[PDB]
Amino acid sequence: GVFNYETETTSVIPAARLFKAFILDGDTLFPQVAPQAISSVENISGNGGPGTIKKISFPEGLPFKYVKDRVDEVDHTNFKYNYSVIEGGPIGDTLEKISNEIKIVATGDGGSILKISNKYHTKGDHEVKAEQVKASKEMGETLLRAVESYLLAHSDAYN
Amino acid sequence: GVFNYETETTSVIPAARLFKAFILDGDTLFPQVAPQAISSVENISGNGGPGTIKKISFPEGLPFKYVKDRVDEVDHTNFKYNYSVIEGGPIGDTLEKISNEIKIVATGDGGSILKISNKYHTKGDHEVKAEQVKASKEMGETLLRAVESYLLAHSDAYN
C-alpha cells in the first residue's frame, strides 16, 4: 500500500534564505551543525539536480548505518524539494521506498513554514510503525534547528 | 586580451573516484580537509549544475576574503569540469574573469592525471603577473593533496 503522513514545522528564518541553507546546502552543513545526527554526506552520482544519488552516513549509535537518497526535483521557484529514500535504513522486507516532499512557505511575520510530506510504499496491506514516522519528523526538526542556529550565529551567511 | 596557462598534476587516486570527491563533492570536503585554504563554501544560486553560483570564503590571512565561482559545465562522461571566477579575489581593475577547465584522465598504473587550464580575460594589452598564476596552481595542488589524503585514510569513502 501507499501511506502518506504530513506535518508542518515553523522557522524564524525567511524562506529564501532557509531554502539555500537547509535544502540546497544541506550536504555541507548537516555534518557540521548536527554531528550527532549526520556523520557525512557523499555524492554517488549526478551533480545535484534530478537523478542525483547521495549516501548519508549516521554516527554510530543510531539505528541505521546509512541511507541512499535520490533527488527527484528541485524547484527553486516555489521552494519545493522532492527526494526519495531508496536504500538502507528502514528500506527492506516490507518497505520499498519513502518519497518525500518539502515545501517552504513565507509567513506574514517574515519567517517561514515547512510543509512536509512522507509517502511510504509498503508491501500489500502491511503498515509502517508509528515510531518510524515519529523518528522521521524528529530528525527533520533536529536538522532544521541546527541550521537555524547556525544562521542566527552567522548573519553574513547566505545573504 | 585573453591569456591561457595550462598545467598538469598527477594523482594516485583512480579517475572515477577522484572526480566524485574532488569535483562533485569539493563543496563539502574542502573546508574539512583543507581548513588553511578554504573556510567555507556557500551556494548562492542553482542546485549544482550549469549556472550555479557559489561563494568561497578564505580563512583570514589569505590575500582574498572571497571569490564567486560560476559552474559552466559538468561532464560526468568525460570527467570534465568548467567554471569561472567572476567576482572577488583578483577580479577587478584589469582582470574581468578567469575561465577554468579541469579534465581528469586515467593512467595505465591505475592512477590519474588532471589537465588544468586557466584562461584570463584582461583589459586591452594588460598582462597578469606570474605570482597570480603560480598561486592558482599551488592552491589547486594543495586542495588535491588534501582530498587525496582523506581518501587514502577512508577506503570506504566514494566507492
Side-chain angles (χ1 to χ4, degrees):
Chain A
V2 177
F3 300 98
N4 188 226
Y5 298 98
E6 311 178 304
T7 186
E8 269 166 47
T9 169
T10 296
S11 171
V12 78
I13 304 298
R17 183 164 188 226
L18 184 55
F19 187 70
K20 288 175 185 182
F22 190 68
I23 301 299
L24 302 192
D25 270 352
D27 288 20
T28 72
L29 293 180
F30 296 154
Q32 295 185 64
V33 308
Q36 296 191 72
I38 304 297
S39 58
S40 73
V41 181
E42 278 172 36
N43 203 77
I44 293 295
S45 182
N47 59 63
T52 292
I53 303 286
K54 299 177 180 180
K55 184 178 182 168
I56 303 174
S57 293
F58 304 104
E60 281 323 297
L62 285 71
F64 309 127
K65 180 192 176 187
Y66 80 97
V67 297
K68 279 184 186 166
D69 291 348
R70 178 224 294 139
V71 179
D72 298 309
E73 193 191 335
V74 180
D75 186 332
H76 297 266
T77 304
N78 302 294
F79 301 137
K80 192 163 73 74
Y81 184 61
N82 294 75
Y83 72 94
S84 305
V85 174
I86 56 166
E87 191 188 292
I91 303 309
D93 61 287
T94 54
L95 182 59
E96 196 247 334
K97 64 170 179 185
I98 306 172
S99 310
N100 311 120
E101 176 175 297
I102 294 170
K103 180 186 177 189
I104 299 183
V105 178
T107 63
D109 69 341
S112 68
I113 288 302
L114 288 78
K115 298 181 170 54
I116 305 169
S117 179
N118 307 310
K119 177 178 296 64
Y120 297 71
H121 174 213
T122 71
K123 173 176 184 170
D125 288 303
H126 287 280
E127 286 177 32
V128 303
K129 301 167 299 174
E131 288 296 286
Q132 161 54 47
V133 167
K134 182 179 180 182
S136 183
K137 307 194 190 308
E138 296 199 305
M139 176 149 276
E141 273 293 66
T142 291
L143 295 175
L144 170 62
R145 300 281 110 67
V147 168
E148 210 171 51
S149 182
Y150 175 77
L151 299 177
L152 297 176
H154 304 86
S155 59
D156 61 321
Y158 295 94
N159 65 62
Chain B
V2 177
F3 300 98
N4 188 226
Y5 298 98
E6 311 178 304
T7 186
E8 269 166 47
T9 169
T10 296
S11 171
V12 78
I13 304 298
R17 183 164 188 226
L18 184 55
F19 187 70
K20 288 175 185 182
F22 190 68
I23 301 299
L24 302 192
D25 270 352
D27 288 20
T28 72
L29 293 180
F30 296 154
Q32 295 185 64
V33 308
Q36 296 191 72
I38 304 297
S39 58
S40 73
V41 181
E42 278 172 36
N43 203 77
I44 293 295
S45 182
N47 59 63
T52 292
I53 303 286
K54 299 177 180 180
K55 184 178 182 168
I56 303 174
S57 293
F58 304 104
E60 281 323 297
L62 285 71
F64 309 127
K65 180 192 176 187
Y66 80 97
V67 297
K68 279 184 186 166
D69 291 348
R70 178 224 294 139
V71 179
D72 298 309
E73 193 191 335
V74 180
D75 186 332
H76 297 266
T77 304
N78 302 294
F79 301 137
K80 192 163 73 74
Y81 184 61
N82 294 75
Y83 72 94
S84 305
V85 174
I86 56 166
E87 191 188 292
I91 303 309
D93 61 287
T94 54
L95 182 59
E96 196 247 334
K97 64 170 179 185
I98 306 172
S99 310
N100 311 120
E101 176 175 297
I102 294 170
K103 180 186 177 189
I104 299 183
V105 178
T107 63
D109 69 341
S112 68
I113 288 302
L114 288 78
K115 298 181 170 54
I116 305 169
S117 179
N118 307 310
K119 177 178 296 64
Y120 297 71
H121 174 213
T122 71
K123 173 176 184 170
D125 288 303
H126 287 280
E127 286 177 32
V128 303
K129 301 167 299 174
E131 288 296 286
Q132 161 54 47
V133 167
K134 182 179 180 182
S136 183
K137 307 194 190 308
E138 296 199 305
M139 176 149 276
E141 273 293 66
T142 291
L143 295 175
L144 170 62
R145 300 281 110 67
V147 168
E148 210 171 51
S149 182
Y150 175 77
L151 299 177
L152 297 176
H154 304 86
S155 59
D156 61 321
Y158 295 94
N159 65 62

mmCIF file with all atom_site columns, all heavy atoms in Angstrom, chain A residues 55-68:
data_model
loop_
_atom_site.group_PDB
_atom_site.id
_atom_site.type_symbol
_atom_site.label_atom_id
_atom_site.label_alt_id
_atom_site.label_comp_id
_atom_site.label_asym_id
_atom_site.label_entity_id
_atom_site.label_seq_id
_atom_site.pdbx_PDB_ins_code
_atom_site.Cartn_x
_atom_site.Cartn_y
_atom_site.Cartn_z
_atom_site.occupancy
_atom_site.B_iso_or_equiv
_atom_site.pdbx_formal_charge
_atom_site.auth_seq_id
_atom_site.auth_comp_id
_atom_site.auth_asym_id
_atom_site.auth_atom_id
_atom_site.pdbx_PDB_model_num
ATOM 1   N N   . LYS A 1 55 ? 24.692 9.427  -0.548 1.00 0.00 ? 55 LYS A N   1
ATOM 2   C CA  . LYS A 1 55 ? 24.776 8.454  0.527  1.00 0.00 ? 55 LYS A CA  1
ATOM 3   C C   . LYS A 1 55 ? 24.963 9.222  1.826  1.00 0.00 ? 55 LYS A C   1
ATOM 4   O O   . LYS A 1 55 ? 25.904 10.003 1.966  1.00 0.00 ? 55 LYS A O   1
ATOM 5   C CB  . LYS A 1 55 ? 25.952 7.507  0.297  1.00 0.00 ? 55 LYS A CB  1
ATOM 6   C CG  . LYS A 1 55 ? 26.072 6.395  1.321  1.00 0.00 ? 55 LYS A CG  1
ATOM 7   C CD  . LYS A 1 55 ? 27.241 5.494  0.964  1.00 0.00 ? 55 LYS A CD  1
ATOM 8   C CE  . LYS A 1 55 ? 27.390 4.339  1.926  1.00 0.00 ? 55 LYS A CE  1
ATOM 9   N NZ  . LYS A 1 55 ? 28.337 3.336  1.382  1.00 0.00 ? 55 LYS A NZ  1
ATOM 10  N N   . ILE A 1 56 ? 24.041 9.016  2.762  1.00 0.00 ? 56 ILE A N   1
ATOM 11  C CA  . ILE A 1 56 ? 24.101 9.687  4.044  1.00 0.00 ? 56 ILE A CA  1
ATOM 12  C C   . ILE A 1 56 ? 24.487 8.677  5.108  1.00 0.00 ? 56 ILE A C   1
ATOM 13  O O   . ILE A 1 56 ? 23.852 7.630  5.237  1.00 0.00 ? 56 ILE A O   1
ATOM 14  C CB  . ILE A 1 56 ? 22.741 10.314 4.388  1.00 0.00 ? 56 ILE A CB  1
ATOM 15  C CG1 . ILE A 1 56 ? 22.334 11.274 3.267  1.00 0.00 ? 56 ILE A CG1 1
ATOM 16  C CG2 . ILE A 1 56 ? 22.819 11.051 5.729  1.00 0.00 ? 56 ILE A CG2 1
ATOM 17  C CD1 . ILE A 1 56 ? 20.942 11.843 3.421  1.00 0.00 ? 56 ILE A CD1 1
ATOM 18  N N   . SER A 1 57 ? 25.543 8.976  5.853  1.00 0.00 ? 57 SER A N   1
ATOM 19  C CA  . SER A 1 57 ? 26.009 8.083  6.907  1.00 0.00 ? 57 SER A CA  1
ATOM 20  C C   . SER A 1 57 ? 25.675 8.690  8.256  1.00 0.00 ? 57 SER A C   1
ATOM 21  O O   . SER A 1 57 ? 25.749 9.902  8.427  1.00 0.00 ? 57 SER A O   1
ATOM 22  C CB  . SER A 1 57 ? 27.521 7.865  6.806  1.00 0.00 ? 57 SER A CB  1
ATOM 23  O OG  . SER A 1 57 ? 27.857 7.158  5.629  1.00 0.00 ? 57 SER A OG  1
ATOM 24  N N   . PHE A 1 58 ? 25.316 7.841  9.211  1.00 0.00 ? 58 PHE A N   1
ATOM 25  C CA  . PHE A 1 58 ? 24.952 8.296  10.549 1.00 0.00 ? 58 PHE A CA  1
ATOM 26  C C   . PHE A 1 58 ? 26.011 7.899  11.574 1.00 0.00 ? 58 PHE A C   1
ATOM 27  O O   . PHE A 1 58 ? 26.584 6.810  11.500 1.00 0.00 ? 58 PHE A O   1
ATOM 28  C CB  . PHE A 1 58 ? 23.610 7.677  10.968 1.00 0.00 ? 58 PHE A CB  1
ATOM 29  C CG  . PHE A 1 58 ? 22.486 7.945  10.006 1.00 0.00 ? 58 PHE A CG  1
ATOM 30  C CD1 . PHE A 1 58 ? 22.045 6.948  9.143  1.00 0.00 ? 58 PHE A CD1 1
ATOM 31  C CD2 . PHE A 1 58 ? 21.868 9.191  9.962  1.00 0.00 ? 58 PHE A CD2 1
ATOM 32  C CE1 . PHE A 1 58 ? 21.001 7.192  8.249  1.00 0.00 ? 58 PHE A CE1 1
ATOM 33  C CE2 . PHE A 1 58 ? 20.824 9.446  9.071  1.00 0.00 ? 58 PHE A CE2 1
ATOM 34  C CZ  . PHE A 1 58 ? 20.389 8.446  8.215  1.00 0.00 ? 58 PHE A CZ  1
ATOM 35  N N   . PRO A 1 59 ? 26.290 8.782  12.543 1.00 0.00 ? 59 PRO A N   1
ATOM 36  C CA  . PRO A 1 59 ? 27.291 8.439  13.553 1.00 0.00 ? 59 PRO A CA  1
ATOM 37  C C   . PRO A 1 59 ? 26.869 7.141  14.239 1.00 0.00 ? 59 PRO A C   1
ATOM 38  O O   . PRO A 1 59 ? 25.677 6.854  14.360 1.00 0.00 ? 59 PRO A O   1
ATOM 39  C CB  . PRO A 1 59 ? 27.269 9.652  14.488 1.00 0.00 ? 59 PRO A CB  1
ATOM 40  C CG  . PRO A 1 59 ? 25.893 10.237 14.284 1.00 0.00 ? 59 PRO A CG  1
ATOM 41  C CD  . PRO A 1 59 ? 25.707 10.108 12.804 1.00 0.00 ? 59 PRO A CD  1
ATOM 42  N N   . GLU A 1 60 ? 27.833 6.338  14.673 1.00 0.00 ? 60 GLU A N   1
ATOM 43  C CA  . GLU A 1 60 ? 27.468 5.088  15.319 1.00 0.00 ? 60 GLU A CA  1
ATOM 44  C C   . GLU A 1 60 ? 26.767 5.282  16.651 1.00 0.00 ? 60 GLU A C   1
ATOM 45  O O   . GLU A 1 60 ? 27.285 5.926  17.565 1.00 0.00 ? 60 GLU A O   1
ATOM 46  C CB  . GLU A 1 60 ? 28.681 4.177  15.451 1.00 0.00 ? 60 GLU A CB  1
ATOM 47  C CG  . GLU A 1 60 ? 28.968 3.484  14.131 1.00 0.00 ? 60 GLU A CG  1
ATOM 48  C CD  . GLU A 1 60 ? 27.676 3.113  13.403 1.00 0.00 ? 60 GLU A CD  1
ATOM 49  O OE1 . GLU A 1 60 ? 26.895 2.302  13.948 1.00 0.00 ? 60 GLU A OE1 1
ATOM 50  O OE2 . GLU A 1 60 ? 27.435 3.643  12.295 1.00 0.00 ? 60 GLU A OE2 1
ATOM 51  N N   . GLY A 1 61 ? 25.566 4.717  16.728 1.00 0.00 ? 61 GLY A N   1
ATOM 52  C CA  . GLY A 1 61 ? 24.738 4.828  17.911 1.00 0.00 ? 61 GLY A CA  1
ATOM 53  C C   . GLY A 1 61 ? 23.306 4.966  17.433 1.00 0.00 ? 61 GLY A C   1
ATOM 54  O O   . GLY A 1 61 ? 22.358 4.740  18.186 1.00 0.00 ? 61 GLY A O   1
ATOM 55  N N   . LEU A 1 62 ? 23.147 5.352  16.170 1.00 0.00 ? 62 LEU A N   1
ATOM 56  C CA  . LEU A 1 62 ? 21.824 5.492  15.582 1.00 0.00 ? 62 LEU A CA  1
ATOM 57  C C   . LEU A 1 62 ? 21.414 4.122  15.074 1.00 0.00 ? 62 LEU A C   1
ATOM 58  O O   . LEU A 1 62 ? 22.261 3.251  14.874 1.00 0.00 ? 62 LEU A O   1
ATOM 59  C CB  . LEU A 1 62 ? 21.829 6.514  14.439 1.00 0.00 ? 62 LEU A CB  1
ATOM 60  C CG  . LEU A 1 62 ? 21.900 7.968  14.924 1.00 0.00 ? 62 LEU A CG  1
ATOM 61  C CD1 . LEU A 1 62 ? 23.284 8.232  15.495 1.00 0.00 ? 62 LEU A CD1 1
ATOM 62  C CD2 . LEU A 1 62 ? 21.597 8.936  13.783 1.00 0.00 ? 62 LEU A CD2 1
ATOM 63  N N   . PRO A 1 63 ? 20.107 3.909  14.863 1.00 0.00 ? 63 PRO A N   1
ATOM 64  C CA  . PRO A 1 63 ? 19.605 2.620  14.385 1.00 0.00 ? 63 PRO A CA  1
ATOM 65  C C   . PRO A 1 63 ? 20.099 2.212  13.001 1.00 0.00 ? 63 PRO A C   1
ATOM 66  O O   . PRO A 1 63 ? 20.133 1.025  12.681 1.00 0.00 ? 63 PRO A O   1
ATOM 67  C CB  . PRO A 1 63 ? 18.092 2.809  14.430 1.00 0.00 ? 63 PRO A CB  1
ATOM 68  C CG  . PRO A 1 63 ? 17.946 4.258  14.075 1.00 0.00 ? 63 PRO A CG  1
ATOM 69  C CD  . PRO A 1 63 ? 19.021 4.905  14.921 1.00 0.00 ? 63 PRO A CD  1
ATOM 70  N N   . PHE A 1 64 ? 20.486 3.185  12.184 1.00 0.00 ? 64 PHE A N   1
ATOM 71  C CA  . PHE A 1 64 ? 20.949 2.870  10.838 1.00 0.00 ? 64 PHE A CA  1
ATOM 72  C C   . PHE A 1 64 ? 22.373 3.318  10.551 1.00 0.00 ? 64 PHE A C   1
ATOM 73  O O   . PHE A 1 64 ? 22.861 4.291  11.112 1.00 0.00 ? 64 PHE A O   1
ATOM 74  C CB  . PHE A 1 64 ? 20.005 3.488  9.810  1.00 0.00 ? 64 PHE A CB  1
ATOM 75  C CG  . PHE A 1 64 ? 18.568 3.167  10.050 1.00 0.00 ? 64 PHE A CG  1
ATOM 76  C CD1 . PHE A 1 64 ? 17.620 4.183  10.121 1.00 0.00 ? 64 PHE A CD1 1
ATOM 77  C CD2 . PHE A 1 64 ? 18.154 1.848  10.207 1.00 0.00 ? 64 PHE A CD2 1
ATOM 78  C CE1 . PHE A 1 64 ? 16.278 3.888  10.342 1.00 0.00 ? 64 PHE A CE1 1
ATOM 79  C CE2 . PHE A 1 64 ? 16.817 1.541  10.430 1.00 0.00 ? 64 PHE A CE2 1
ATOM 80  C CZ  . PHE A 1 64 ? 15.876 2.564  10.498 1.00 0.00 ? 64 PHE A CZ  1
ATOM 81  N N   . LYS A 1 65 ? 23.032 2.587  9.664  1.00 0.00 ? 65 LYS A N   1
ATOM 82  C CA  . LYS A 1 65 ? 24.398 2.899  9.281  1.00 0.00 ? 65 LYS A CA  1
ATOM 83  C C   . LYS A 1 65 ? 24.383 3.968  8.188  1.00 0.00 ? 65 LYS A C   1
ATOM 84  O O   . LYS A 1 65 ? 25.177 4.909  8.222  1.00 0.00 ? 65 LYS A O   1
ATOM 85  C CB  . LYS A 1 65 ? 25.089 1.632  8.775  1.00 0.00 ? 65 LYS A CB  1
ATOM 86  C CG  . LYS A 1 65 ? 26.535 1.820  8.341  1.00 0.00 ? 65 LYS A CG  1
ATOM 87  C CD  . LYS A 1 65 ? 27.021 0.591  7.579  1.00 0.00 ? 65 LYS A CD  1
ATOM 88  C CE  . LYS A 1 65 ? 28.436 0.775  7.050  1.00 0.00 ? 65 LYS A CE  1
ATOM 89  N NZ  . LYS A 1 65 ? 28.838 -0.360 6.163  1.00 0.00 ? 65 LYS A NZ  1
ATOM 90  N N   . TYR A 1 66 ? 23.463 3.825  7.233  1.00 0.00 ? 66 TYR A N   1
ATOM 91  C CA  . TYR A 1 66 ? 23.352 4.778  6.128  1.00 0.00 ? 66 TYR A CA  1
ATOM 92  C C   . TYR A 1 66 ? 22.047 4.623  5.354  1.00 0.00 ? 66 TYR A C   1
ATOM 93  O O   . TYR A 1 66 ? 21.340 3.637  5.503  1.00 0.00 ? 66 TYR A O   1
ATOM 94  C CB  . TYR A 1 66 ? 24.481 4.551  5.118  1.00 0.00 ? 66 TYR A CB  1
ATOM 95  C CG  . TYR A 1 66 ? 24.194 3.381  4.196  1.00 0.00 ? 66 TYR A CG  1
ATOM 96  C CD1 . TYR A 1 66 ? 23.643 3.587  2.934  1.00 0.00 ? 66 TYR A CD1 1
ATOM 97  C CD2 . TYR A 1 66 ? 24.412 2.072  4.605  1.00 0.00 ? 66 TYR A CD2 1
ATOM 98  C CE1 . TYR A 1 66 ? 23.315 2.521  2.107  1.00 0.00 ? 66 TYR A CE1 1
ATOM 99  C CE2 . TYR A 1 66 ? 24.086 0.994  3.785  1.00 0.00 ? 66 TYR A CE2 1
ATOM 100 C CZ  . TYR A 1 66 ? 23.538 1.228  2.537  1.00 0.00 ? 66 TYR A CZ  1
ATOM 101 O OH  . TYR A 1 66 ? 23.195 0.170  1.720  1.00 0.00 ? 66 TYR A OH  1
ATOM 102 N N   . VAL A 1 67 ? 21.755 5.610  4.512  1.00 0.00 ? 67 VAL A N   1
ATOM 103 C CA  . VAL A 1 67 ? 20.597 5.561  3.625  1.00 0.00 ? 67 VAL A CA  1
ATOM 104 C C   . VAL A 1 67 ? 21.039 6.220  2.331  1.00 0.00 ? 67 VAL A C   1
ATOM 105 O O   . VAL A 1 67 ? 21.919 7.074  2.333  1.00 0.00 ? 67 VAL A O   1
ATOM 106 C CB  . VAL A 1 67 ? 19.358 6.350  4.143  1.00 0.00 ? 67 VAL A CB  1
ATOM 107 C CG1 . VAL A 1 67 ? 18.850 5.746  5.437  1.00 0.00 ? 67 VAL A CG1 1
ATOM 108 C CG2 . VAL A 1 67 ? 19.706 7.817  4.317  1.00 0.00 ? 67 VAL A CG2 1
ATOM 109 N N   . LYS A 1 68 ? 20.447 5.790  1.228  1.00 0.00 ? 68 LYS A N   1
ATOM 110 C CA  . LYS A 1 68 ? 20.735 6.390  -0.060 1.00 0.00 ? 68 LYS A CA  1
ATOM 111 C C   . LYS A 1 68 ? 19.488 7.156  -0.460 1.00 0.00 ? 68 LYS A C   1
ATOM 112 O O   . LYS A 1 68 ? 18.384 6.612  -0.435 1.00 0.00 ? 68 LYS A O   1
ATOM 113 C CB  . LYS A 1 68 ? 21.058 5.326  -1.116 1.00 0.00 ? 68 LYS A CB  1
ATOM 114 C CG  . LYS A 1 68 ? 22.489 4.807  -1.059 1.00 0.00 ? 68 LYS A CG  1
ATOM 115 C CD  . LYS A 1 68 ? 22.761 3.837  -2.197 1.00 0.00 ? 68 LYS A CD  1
ATOM 116 C CE  . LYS A 1 68 ? 24.144 3.203  -2.067 1.00 0.00 ? 68 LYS A CE  1
ATOM 117 N NZ  . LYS A 1 68 ? 24.288 2.016  -2.956 1.00 0.00 ? 68 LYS A NZ  1
#
